[PDB]
């Protein structure tokens, strides 16, 4: 590449100006992606002759 | 979940925090929940009015309903990698 | 403007490397050594590329880089980044807990020149989390 | 249920709904979720006459004996 | 202890419940579910006498306890 | 043995009913189906707002939320 | 799938209505499934009906977050 | 059913009111089970239609699946 | 975590805008606390020696 897509590509914590340790930390360690690790929602999501039966 | 891994990824930071009731606060975040409760350190004082009466409180409990805002500032967090990391959740 | 053209040259060069050979990051460091003031613009893209070596899949140009890292860390004082120094003593004490020793070595050598560089009290991770991860790599 | 409305049904009951209102009526019939069928359903908010009618239990707030 | 647990410790015991309304509910627990949604016997109300009431859980404000509820519960 | 409020709404399927919402607002219409969260479609909707007064007359196939939904009257 | 059409206008600015008569304009940098919401460079406009007239009191915070339950209205200016 | 109807107005010109009386005249994009409503060239109108335009939005328009409250067609 | 909070006189903001000094001895994942000697902020008005207080209620915590 060149030094232009260096910096332009920058980091995680170079891009983000680091300033959380559990940005840079976690999204270096065990990261893949930033800030990725409701019942009732897929539920209603997921929402007669069946009932009377 | 994502604004979950967002405020659960900011911890020691001083950011502003208005409620419905229009109490507006400063303080040190330090611990996170599921259902994004905040606890804040140094509480700190905004404006003359929409501060509550606390004298000596150093640390608070918010639930996370009250909130209305949360006062960042852009040299804190990178909203890009927050960005792409919603395209690739949703 | 060629001093401008020899650091793009150095990281073309020291990004694009296929063989195995300890010089490059020894000599660029002795550039780096040579002019500092100088490199805050292309100090952040260098760190930039150090990061992108940091991580990746052969223990080569991982030890390069982290050796590498090493004999930058006195140059970004100069330049007084210091929380720069914080976010790499973030990744590299996360990649401390590498398989390979080859590699981890030259990791504890950015170390040692981070916490040596900057002063203990804003150093991040902090020390006291650092020297109980240590206390097995004795081993 | 934690409320046997056995004993309620067929008797006339005085609800209170959210925002409001207030319901007075026989009571027909319910279900595990306490959603009610009221006969000669009346309404004070300040007199309004209904029929038959068909109770939220999920925005009710309470449930009394009239 | 856990508030849930303490109104399932506590049965038949009299106590003032404040509700969004503004309605003074006085009355004596008989059931208690996951929701807290109560049933009172011996019931009162300020702005009317009643056997039973029923009171759903998310309507309530706070809940004036008798004094003893720690010795007769625990 | 309990008549069932989904047995009644069954009934008063495609036929006149006035539905009363959490507000001052109520709706009056032909019901022609619903589910288990009680999401109503009803044919040609009247809104009304009690203490009355008119806004507008719907015509075609309304959905309306079952959650500001109050009291369903027959009639 | 609306969110889906959210990713439109992603990192472009835009407008926002939300409970209160509250207004914000902004960059949008998030939603989600409860429609949480961060902005940048962002402005807040705030309708306040005092003493029988109209008035807004104008807060500018470049970088803020939004909580889904006051959402009201998404769209562009 | 409901989902049919949904399946049924989708692109579809719609006139969606919220708990705050504003009414919403607009193509439907799409909706989801959480009655979600994402418009196109959508025009606000204080309660009926035949109210004041207070603004215009050609862009797609997103509402709130809890502050919605019925959703009308021509 | 209110679990840092048990035992302490704490200082909590309702929704209506009322506040209150006073012991919590209780918490859940609801925000449902037992509270105990109550006390008001400004009013210093004492009103029980035991109540329970709905999560939905509180709109702010503080440690005194």
Redesign the interface.
Same mark, same amino acid.
């Given at each position: 590449e060149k030094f232009q897509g260096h910096g332009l590509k920058t980091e995680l914590h170079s891009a983000l100006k680091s300033s959380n340790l559990n940005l840079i930390r976690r999204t270096y360690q065990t990261g893949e992606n930033p800030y990725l690790s409701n019942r009732r929602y897929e539920r209603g999501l997921k929402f007669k002759r069946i009932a009377q039966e | 979940?994502? @604004? @979950?891994?967002?405020f659960?990824?900011? $911890?020691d930071?001083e950011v502003v925090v208005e409620?419905?009731?229009d #109490?507006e606060i400063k303080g040190t975040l330090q611990?996170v &929940?599921q259902?994004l409760?905040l606890?804040l350190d140094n #509480?700190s004082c905004t404006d003359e009015k929409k501060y509550?009466?606390?004298g000596?409180?150093?640390? #608070?409990? #918010?639930?996370?309903?009250?909130?209305? !805002? $949360? !006062?960042?500032?852009?040299?804190?967090? &990178?909203?890009?990698?927050?960005?792409?990391?919603?395209?690739?959740?949703? | 403007r060629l001093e401008t053209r020899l650091i793009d040259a150095l990281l073309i060069a020291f990004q694009e490397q296929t063989n195995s050979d300890s010089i490059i990051f020894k000599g660029f460091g002795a550039v780096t050594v040579s002019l500092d003031i100088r490199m805050k613009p292309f100090l952040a893209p260098i760190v930039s590329t150090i990061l992108n070596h940091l991580k990746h899949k052969t223990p080569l140009v991982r030890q390069h880089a982290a050796d590498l890292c090493a004999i930058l860390i006195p140059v970004i004082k100069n330049c007084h980044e210091f929380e720069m120094l914080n976010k790499l003593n973030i990744i590299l004490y996360e990649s401390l807990g590498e398989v390979y020793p080859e590699v981890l070595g030259s990791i504890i050598n950015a170390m040692y020149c981070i916490t040596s560089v900057m002063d203990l009290d804003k150093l991040q991770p902090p020390i006291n989390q650092i020297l109980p991860t240590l206390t097995p790599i004795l081993r | 249920a934690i409320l046997d409305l056995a004993k309620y049904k067929d008797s006339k009951i005085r609800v209170k709904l959210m925002g409001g209102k207030l319901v007075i009526g026989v009571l027909k019939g319910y279900d595990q979720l306490m959603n009610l069928v009221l006969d000669d359903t009346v309404e004070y908010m300040n007199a309004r006459k209904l029929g038959l009618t068909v109770i939220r239990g999920t925005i009710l707030v309470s449930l009394s004996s009239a | 202890m856990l508030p849930l647990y303490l109104l399932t410790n506590a049965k038949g015991q009299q106590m003032q419940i404040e509700l969004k309304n503004g309605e003074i509910i006085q009355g004596i627990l008989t059931n208690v579910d996951n929701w807290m949604n109560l049933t009172l016997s011996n019931v009162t109300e300020y702005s009317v006498k009643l056997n039973e009431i029923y009171i759903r859980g998310t309507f309530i404000k706070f809940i004036k306890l008798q004094d003893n509820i720690i010795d007769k519960v625990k | 043995p309990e008549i069932l409020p989904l047995e009644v709404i069954d009934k008063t399927i495609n036929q006149k009913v006035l539905i009363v919402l959490q507000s001052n607002r109520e709706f009056e219409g032909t019901l022609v189906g619903f589910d288990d969260f009680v999401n109503v479609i009803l044919e040609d909707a009247v809104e009304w707002l009690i203490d009355n007064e008119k806004v507008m007359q719907h015509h075609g196939r309304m959905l309306l939320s079952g959650n500001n939904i109050a009291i369903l009257v027959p009639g | 799938t609306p969110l889906d059409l959210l990713k439109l206008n992603l990192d472009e600015r835009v407008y926002i209505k939300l409970r209160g008569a509250r207004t914000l304009v902004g960059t949008l940098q998030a939603f989600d499934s409860h429609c949480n919401i961060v902005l940048s460079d962002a402005v807040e406009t705030i309708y306040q009906l005092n003493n029988e007239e109209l008035s807004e009191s104008e807060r500018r915070c470049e970088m803020v977050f939004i909580r889904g339950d006051t959402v009201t209205l998404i769209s562009t200016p | 059913v409901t989902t049919e109807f949904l399946s049924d107005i989708i692109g579809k010109t719609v006139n969606v009111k919220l708990a705050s009386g504003l009414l919403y005249s607009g193509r439907l994009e799409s909706i989801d089970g959480f009655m979600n409503v994402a418009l196109s060239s959508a025009t606000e109108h204080y309660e009926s239609n035949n109210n004041k335009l207070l603004n215009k939005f050609n862009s797609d328009v997103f509402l709130r699946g809890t502050q919605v409250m019925y959703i009308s067609e021509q | 975590t209110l679990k840092d909070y048990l035992n302490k006189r704490v200082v909590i903001i309702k929704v209506d805008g009322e506040c209150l000094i006073a012991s919590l001895n209780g918490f859940d994942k609801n925000t449902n606390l037992f509270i105990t000697n109550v006390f008001n902020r400004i009013s210093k008005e004492f009103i029980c020696k035991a109540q329970l207080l709905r999560g939905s209620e509180i709109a702010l915590v503080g440690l005194i």
């Amino acid at each position: 590449e060149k030094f232009q897509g260096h910096g332009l590509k920058t980091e995680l914590h170079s891009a983000l100006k680091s300033s959380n340790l559990n940005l840079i930390r976690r999204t270096y360690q065990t990261g893949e992606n930033p800030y990725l690790s409701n019942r009732r929602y897929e539920r209603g999501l997921k929402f007669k002759r069946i009932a009377q039966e | 979940m994502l @604004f @979950f891994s967002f405020f659960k990824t900011l $911890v020691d930071q001083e950011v502003v925090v208005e409620l419905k009731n229009d #109490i507006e606060i400063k303080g040190t975040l330090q611990s996170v &929940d599921q259902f994004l409760n905040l606890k804040l350190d140094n #509480i700190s004082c905004t404006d003359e009015k929409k501060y509550p009466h606390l004298g000596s409180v150093r640390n #608070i409990f #918010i639930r996370g309903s009250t909130v209305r !805002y $949360v !006062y960042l500032n852009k040299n804190m967090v &990178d909203t890009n990698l927050l960005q792409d990391a919603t395209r690739r959740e949703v | 403007r060629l001093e401008t053209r020899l650091i793009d040259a150095l990281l073309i060069a020291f990004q694009e490397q296929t063989n195995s050979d300890s010089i490059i990051f020894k000599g660029f460091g002795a550039v780096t050594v040579s002019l500092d003031i100088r490199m805050k613009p292309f100090l952040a893209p260098i760190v930039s590329t150090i990061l992108n070596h940091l991580k990746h899949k052969t223990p080569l140009v991982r030890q390069h880089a982290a050796d590498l890292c090493a004999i930058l860390i006195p140059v970004i004082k100069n330049c007084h980044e210091f929380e720069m120094l914080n976010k790499l003593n973030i990744i590299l004490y996360e990649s401390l807990g590498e398989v390979y020793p080859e590699v981890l070595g030259s990791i504890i050598n950015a170390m040692y020149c981070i916490t040596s560089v900057m002063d203990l009290d804003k150093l991040q991770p902090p020390i006291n989390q650092i020297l109980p991860t240590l206390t097995p790599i004795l081993r | 249920a934690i409320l046997d409305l056995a004993k309620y049904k067929d008797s006339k009951i005085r609800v209170k709904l959210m925002g409001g209102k207030l319901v007075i009526g026989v009571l027909k019939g319910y279900d595990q979720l306490m959603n009610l069928v009221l006969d000669d359903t009346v309404e004070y908010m300040n007199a309004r006459k209904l029929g038959l009618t068909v109770i939220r239990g999920t925005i009710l707030v309470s449930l009394s004996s009239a | 202890m856990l508030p849930l647990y303490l109104l399932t410790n506590a049965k038949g015991q009299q106590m003032q419940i404040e509700l969004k309304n503004g309605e003074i509910i006085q009355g004596i627990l008989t059931n208690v579910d996951n929701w807290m949604n109560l049933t009172l016997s011996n019931v009162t109300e300020y702005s009317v006498k009643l056997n039973e009431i029923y009171i759903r859980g998310t309507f309530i404000k706070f809940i004036k306890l008798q004094d003893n509820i720690i010795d007769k519960v625990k | 043995p309990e008549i069932l409020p989904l047995e009644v709404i069954d009934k008063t399927i495609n036929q006149k009913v006035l539905i009363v919402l959490q507000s001052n607002r109520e709706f009056e219409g032909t019901l022609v189906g619903f589910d288990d969260f009680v999401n109503v479609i009803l044919e040609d909707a009247v809104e009304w707002l009690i203490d009355n007064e008119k806004v507008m007359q719907h015509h075609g196939r309304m959905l309306l939320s079952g959650n500001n939904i109050a009291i369903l009257v027959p009639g | 799938t609306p969110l889906d059409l959210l990713k439109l206008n992603l990192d472009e600015r835009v407008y926002i209505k939300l409970r209160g008569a509250r207004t914000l304009v902004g960059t949008l940098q998030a939603f989600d499934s409860h429609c949480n919401i961060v902005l940048s460079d962002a402005v807040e406009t705030i309708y306040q009906l005092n003493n029988e007239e109209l008035s807004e009191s104008e807060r500018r915070c470049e970088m803020v977050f939004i909580r889904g339950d006051t959402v009201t209205l998404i769209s562009t200016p | 059913v409901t989902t049919e109807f949904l399946s049924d107005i989708i692109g579809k010109t719609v006139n969606v009111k919220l708990a705050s009386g504003l009414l919403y005249s607009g193509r439907l994009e799409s909706i989801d089970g959480f009655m979600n409503v994402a418009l196109s060239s959508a025009t606000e109108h204080y309660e009926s239609n035949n109210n004041k335009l207070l603004n215009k939005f050609n862009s797609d328009v997103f509402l709130r699946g809890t502050q919605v409250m019925y959703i009308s067609e021509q | 975590t209110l679990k840092d909070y048990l035992n302490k006189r704490v200082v909590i903001i309702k929704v209506d805008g009322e506040c209150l000094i006073a012991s919590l001895n209780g918490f859940d994942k609801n925000t449902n606390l037992f509270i105990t000697n109550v006390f008001n902020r400004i009013s210093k008005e004492f009103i029980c020696k035991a109540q329970l207080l709905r999560g939905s209620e509180i709109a702010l915590v503080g440690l005194i």
